[PDB]
Symmetry: C3
Subunit: 157 residues, 3 copies
């Protein structure tokens, strides 16, 4: 059988650039405020993968009280999430990630996001979709206040 | 063969307390349950049976005073009647406050019982918008849900 | 052997109605500001179907640098996206679309939308779901600034 997972993440702008989206450093006037590297795309993708194994979420797997992964970048977190999913029997069906930002432009950076995700999951490029949209200057993303990301995943049990 | 559905719901605060989320009454310091409403829409969507509003209109007096678990169970009855069984569900609550985490285990249990499925087929999480937008400003709460049905 | 996709689209209100959603014209005091016809629903659906095929999004298929499909309505883009998807060996599992709008009223027009989608996708009506929700007067949709739409898709490989 197959299993569905969903992830959703939001960070507000603040501090100095650059931002890091899908493992890719992107120059911007502002950074993204977060407890770690603020990678909304990898954070949402990890939640979607973990969800499709009902492992709760990032917060459950890497809690307050566990020093092991404190200060770890999102790719480190993604890989360890994967390792722990792959060992529960699951293999990868496919993923689709949707970044929601008015700015910066994401389009030129998406190719390398896809490469980094494929590497971290040990899968073909063909199993990884990443796209970006604006909200036409509407809402807290449209006004340039933060970045949101939605992600969905299908795993084979 | 499997089938995908999606749900999204929003509840505005009007006296802001208490609220009911995932069948759990939470002190904030229809019945407005965004989690179950979005989960129901997702299951009904996977079954191409429309949404909550299509099955139980506000105009129809027959479900006046029905809570979200009752609509969830009735929705699931009609889905099973069409030959579907559960794969799994993933629910994501979007709220600046109140704190959902202590109540999530209970929500999960309520959903598993209502759908007659294993706990491991039910995933519920909560997250914030970091003080951004209507949820971030404390105006209301939202929920995104997805579901996979079988055959 | 199934594959998942997700799509998300937002257009703002501007100038004059009617609006067009799911291929159906709906009377409203405002129209939708868009490069194309502004069909949020068909645009989200297309992105979801393409995402499942790892073919990115409509922008990747139909840039504004490209003359071929310039000025095409959304139904034509969907049928073309669908042609390219089917060329990779994919067939339709099922689709589910969620329109997020305070107004106008969508429900009376939804059966026709489903008819139009099933025809464009060459599938049974049983494989197409379309729902609509308000945001209880909250956010940019609730205040009537615009309309959003989300969609999910399963393809079979
Ligand atoms: N933050 C963003 C948003 C959109 N884009 C690009 O803009 C194109 C059209 O976006 P939109 O539908 O919001 O007008 C997308 O295909 C592509 O992702 C981008 O590069 N960075
Ligand atoms: N734009 C909209 C929004 C909702 N509706 C209708 O209202 C019902 C309930 O929506 P809500 O719970 O957000 O008030 C929907 O099931 C149905 O689609 C509509 O017809 N047009
Ligand atoms: N309204 C909320 C939001 C988050 N939480 C909890 O906070 C943790 C992290 O949330 P966030 O990503 O917004 O910082 C979640 O794992 C958990 O659900 C909560 O209890 N109530
Ligand atoms: C799944 C979700 C949340 C999708 C929509 C993302 C988005 C652009 C939210 C905007 O917030 P807002 O409309 O509340 O901004 P504000 O009320 O400040 O206009
Ligand atoms: Zn994050
Ligand atoms: Zn569009």
């Amino acid at each position: 059988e197959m299993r569905i997972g969903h992830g959703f993440d939001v960070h507000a702008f603040g501090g100095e650039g650059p931002i890091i989206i899908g493992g890719v450093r992107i120059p911007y006037e502002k950074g993204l405020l977060a407890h770690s590297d603020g990678d909304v795309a990898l954070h949402a993708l990890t939640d979607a993968l973990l969800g499709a194994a009902a492992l709760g979420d990032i917060g459950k797997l890497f809690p307050d009280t566990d020093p092991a992964f404190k200060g770890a970048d999102s790719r480190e977190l993604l890989r360890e999430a994967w390792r722990r999913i792959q060992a529960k029997g699951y293999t990868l069906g496919n993923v689709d990630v949707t970044i929601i930002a008015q700015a910066p432009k994401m389009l030129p950076h998406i190719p390398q996001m896809r490469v980094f995700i494929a590497e971290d999951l040990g899968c073909h490029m063909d199993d990884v979709n990443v796209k970006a949209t604006t909200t036409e200057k509407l809402g807290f993303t449209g006004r340039g206040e933060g970045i949101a990301c939605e992600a969905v995943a299908l795993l084979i049990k």
